[PDB]
Design an enzyme around this catalytic site. Structure first.
Site, PDB file in Angstrom:
ATOM      1  N   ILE A 147       0.984  -1.138   0.176  1.00 29.56           N
ATOM      2  CA  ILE A 147      -0.019  -0.217  -0.052  1.00 29.56           C
ATOM      3  C   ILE A 147       0.961   1.309  -0.172  1.00 29.56           C
ATOM      4  O   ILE A 147       1.019   2.211  -0.925  1.00 29.56           O
ATOM      5  CB  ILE A 147      -1.016  -0.132   1.254  1.00 29.56           C
ATOM      6  CG1 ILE A 147      -2.110  -0.959   1.248  1.00 29.56           C
ATOM      7  CG2 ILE A 147      -1.834   1.574   1.356  1.00 29.56           C
ATOM      8  CD1 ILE A 147      -2.974  -1.162   2.129  1.00 29.56           C
ATOM      9  N   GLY A 148       1.664   1.326   1.051  1.00 33.18           N
ATOM     10  CA  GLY A 148       2.396   2.398   1.142  1.00 33.18           C
ATOM     11  C   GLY A 148       3.350   2.554   2.473  1.00 33.18           C
ATOM     12  O   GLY A 148       3.507   1.366   3.236  1.00 33.18           O
ATOM     13  N   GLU A 149       4.042   3.828   2.855  1.00 31.58           N
ATOM     14  CA  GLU A 149       4.967   3.964   4.232  1.00 31.58           C
ATOM     15  C   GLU A 149       4.300   5.007   4.929  1.00 31.58           C
ATOM     16  O   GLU A 149       3.794   6.142   4.114  1.00 31.58           O
ATOM     17  CB  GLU A 149       6.084   4.167   3.685  1.00 31.58           C
ATOM     18  CG  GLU A 149       7.167   2.877   3.816  1.00 31.58           C
ATOM     19  CD  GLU A 149       7.100   2.034   2.423  1.00 31.58           C
ATOM     20  OE1 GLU A 149       6.092   2.385   1.540  1.00 31.58           O
ATOM     21  OE2 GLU A 149       7.887   1.189   2.314  1.00 31.58           O
ATOM     22  N   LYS A 151       0.523  -2.797   9.053  1.00 35.38           N
ATOM     23  CA  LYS A 151       1.467  -1.984   9.058  1.00 35.38           C
ATOM     24  C   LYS A 151       2.661  -2.719  10.034  1.00 35.38           C
ATOM     25  O   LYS A 151       2.324  -3.023  11.169  1.00 35.38           O
ATOM     26  CB  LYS A 151       1.176  -0.654  10.020  1.00 35.38           C
ATOM     27  CG  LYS A 151       2.450   0.304  10.095  1.00 35.38           C
ATOM     28  CD  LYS A 151       2.494   1.315  10.951  1.00 35.38           C
ATOM     29  CE  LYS A 151       1.263   2.097  10.983  1.00 35.38           C
ATOM     30  NZ  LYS A 151       1.592   3.515  11.788  1.00 35.38           N
ATOM     31  N   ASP A 162       1.036  15.292  12.144  1.00 37.02           N
ATOM     32  CA  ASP A 162       1.425  14.971  10.898  1.00 37.02           C
ATOM     33  C   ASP A 162       0.116  15.032   9.640  1.00 37.02           C
ATOM     34  O   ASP A 162       0.280  14.012   8.689  1.00 37.02           O
ATOM     35  CB  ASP A 162       2.230  13.836  10.649  1.00 37.02           C
ATOM     36  CG  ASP A 162       3.254  13.893   9.223  1.00 37.02           C
ATOM     37  OD1 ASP A 162       3.584  14.845   8.825  1.00 37.02           O
ATOM     38  OD2 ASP A 162       3.755  12.740   9.191  1.00 37.02           O
TER      39      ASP A 162
HETATM   40  C1  LIG Z   1       0.041   6.015   5.849  1.00 38.49           C
HETATM   41  C2  LIG Z   1      -0.893   4.868   5.299  1.00 38.49           C
HETATM   42  C3  LIG Z   1       0.121   4.036   4.225  1.00 38.49           C
HETATM   43  O1  LIG Z   1      -1.191   3.853   6.468  1.00 38.49           O
HETATM   44  C4  LIG Z   1      -2.555   3.377   6.081  1.00 38.49           C
HETATM   45  C5  LIG Z   1      -3.118   2.848   7.059  1.00 38.49           C
HETATM   46  C6  LIG Z   1      -4.129   2.131   6.925  1.00 38.49           C
HETATM   47  C7  LIG Z   1      -4.846   2.041   6.006  1.00 38.49           C
HETATM   48  N1  LIG Z   1      -6.068   1.281   5.650  1.00 38.49           N
HETATM   49  N2  LIG Z   1      -6.326   1.482   4.348  1.00 38.49           N
HETATM   50  C8  LIG Z   1      -5.377   2.046   3.869  1.00 38.49           C
HETATM   51  C9  LIG Z   1      -5.230   2.588   2.434  1.00 38.49           C
HETATM   52  C10 LIG Z   1      -4.695   3.679   2.006  1.00 38.49           C
HETATM   53  C11 LIG Z   1      -4.581   3.943   0.647  1.00 38.49           C
HETATM   54  N3  LIG Z   1      -5.177   3.031  -0.368  1.00 38.49           N
HETATM   55  C12 LIG Z   1      -5.590   2.120   0.155  1.00 38.49           C
HETATM   56  N4  LIG Z   1      -5.971   0.915  -0.778  1.00 38.49           N
HETATM   57  C13 LIG Z   1      -6.710  -0.456  -0.534  1.00 38.49           C
HETATM   58  C14 LIG Z   1      -7.476  -0.994  -1.589  1.00 38.49           C
HETATM   59  O2  LIG Z   1      -6.688  -0.870  -2.695  1.00 38.49           O
HETATM   60  C15 LIG Z   1      -6.277  -0.010  -3.288  1.00 38.49           C
HETATM   61  C16 LIG Z   1      -5.434   0.666  -2.363  1.00 38.49           C
HETATM   62  C17 LIG Z   1      -5.718   1.449   1.524  1.00 38.49           C
HETATM   63  C18 LIG Z   1      -4.533   2.390   4.893  1.00 38.49           C
HETATM   64  C19 LIG Z   1      -2.868   3.142   4.960  1.00 38.49           C
END
Ligand SMILES: CC(C)Oc1ccc2[nH]nc(-c3ccnc(N4CCOCC4)c3)c2c1
Length: 339
Positions: free
Chosen positions: A14-16, A36, A131
């Site tokens: 997903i990301g950092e 995470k 943040d």
């Molecule tokens: C800072 C970020 C990376 O932290 C989070 C923490 C919990 C989260 N829940 N859902 C997300 C999230 C954030 C951005 N895109 C998606 N999706 C999930 C479905 O597929 C496309 C991407 C999910 C997320 C991110």
């Protein structure tokens, strides 16, 4: 390694945040979740930030704040090297949404309402997010918004907010209030309101309002739009060096919000002006922002809950060695263990 299986499988990146986040399929509840991975135990600062995030999010329960559904870690302190935080999976985030489309005013209005509703709860718990930015505002197709990433969150400490001019800062540059560069450690609620003002501006134009390329350039960008601070605001600047710096600058007139945002709702711009106020003592507070005319259609203090158990004291993690912080993280995560 992402040792969350066999219960959580079919991992995708997903990301950092401020750790790495993946999506996963929960084989128990038959739904996709976000996970995470945090590996903080070799550094005292990482341990402090992990303990704060976990302690804060386990105390919070609010519709506009990401929760912690589960925490995975080894059964013993000796074996615990990583911690996995399981959270609700959303569909996207405001950063990704703003890259693909222009938001109508009524979407901006509803998202701003939810941001402020969640921030009211955080502030009522005597907590600062520190943040807030588009990538930390999660969304779904029903337009529900949830604030995430409490890695830099702190218990508010206005009595110890003072620091020198040009003091190093951790949070995302573009969303830093002017006082961070002048006299503030970011330990007061007004720091979050500034970030929300930046996010509102960004929703209005799909561009960051103050994209500083480096630390002092951030203050250049802010003063370039707000213009020179008044004598009264310089009288509240505290630091000799900050005051001298500001007095040395050529006079700059304020850039009207309606020139930057010619198609925006006038009530959105009035609220924007009040959130992007230079002097943090004159900046609008979260409850005032919710009561502003721009959000009148959603405003309902009876449906804008506050925290049941605020953080009354400083956590005092500054002098605890990383070995003691690991014991505290272990204890804080115990409720999620099989036993
Ligand atoms: C800072 C970020 C990376 O932290 C989070 C923490 C919990 C989260 N829940 N859902 C997300 C999230 C954030 C951005 N895109 C998606 N999706 C999930 C479905 O597929 C496309 C991407 C999910 C997320 C991110």
């Amino acid at each position: 390694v992402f040792d969350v299986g066999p219960r959580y499988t079919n991992l995708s990146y997903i990301g950092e945040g401020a750790g790495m986040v993946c999506s996963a399929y929960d084989n128990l509840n038959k739904v996709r979740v976000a996970i995470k991975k945090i590996s903080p135990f070799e550094h005292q600062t990482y341990c402090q930030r992990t303990l704060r995030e976990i302690k804060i999010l386990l105390r919070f329960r609010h519709e506009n704040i990401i929760g912690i559904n589960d925490i995975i870690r080894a059964p013993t302190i000796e074996q615990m090297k990583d911690v996995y935080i399981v959270q609700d999976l959303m569909e996207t985030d405001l950063y990704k949404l703003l890259k693909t489309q222009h938001l109508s005013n009524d979407h901006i209005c509803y998202f701003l309402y939810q941001i402020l509703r969640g921030l009211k709860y955080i502030h009522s718990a005597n907590v600062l997010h520190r943040d807030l930015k588009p990538s930390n505002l999660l969304l779904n197709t029903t337009c529900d918004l949830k604030i995430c990433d409490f890695g830099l969150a702190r218990v508010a400490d206005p009595d110890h907010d003072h620091t020198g001019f040009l003091t190093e800062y951790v949070a995302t540059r573009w969303y830093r209030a002017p006082e961070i560069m002048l006299n503030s450690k970011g330990y007061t609620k007004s720091i979050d309101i500034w970030s929300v003002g930046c996010i509102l501006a960004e929703m209005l134009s799909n561009r960051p309002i103050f994209p500083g390329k480096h630390y002092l350039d951030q203050l250049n960008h802010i003063l370039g739009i707000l213009g020179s601070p008044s004598q009264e605001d310089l009288n509240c600047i505290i630091n000799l060096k900050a005051r001298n710096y500001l007095l040395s600058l050529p006079h700059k007139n304020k850039v009207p919000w309606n020139r930057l945002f010619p198609n925006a709702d006038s009530k959105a711009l009035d609220l924007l002006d009040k959130m992007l106020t230079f002097n943090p003592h004159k900046r609008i507070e979260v409850e005032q922002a919710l009561a502003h005319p721009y959000l009148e259609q959603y405003y309902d203090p009876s449906d804008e809950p506050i925290a049941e158990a605020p953080f009354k004291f400083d956590m005092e993690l500054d002098d605890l060695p990383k070995e003691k912080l690991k014991e505290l993280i272990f204890e804080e995560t115990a409720r999620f263990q099989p036993g």
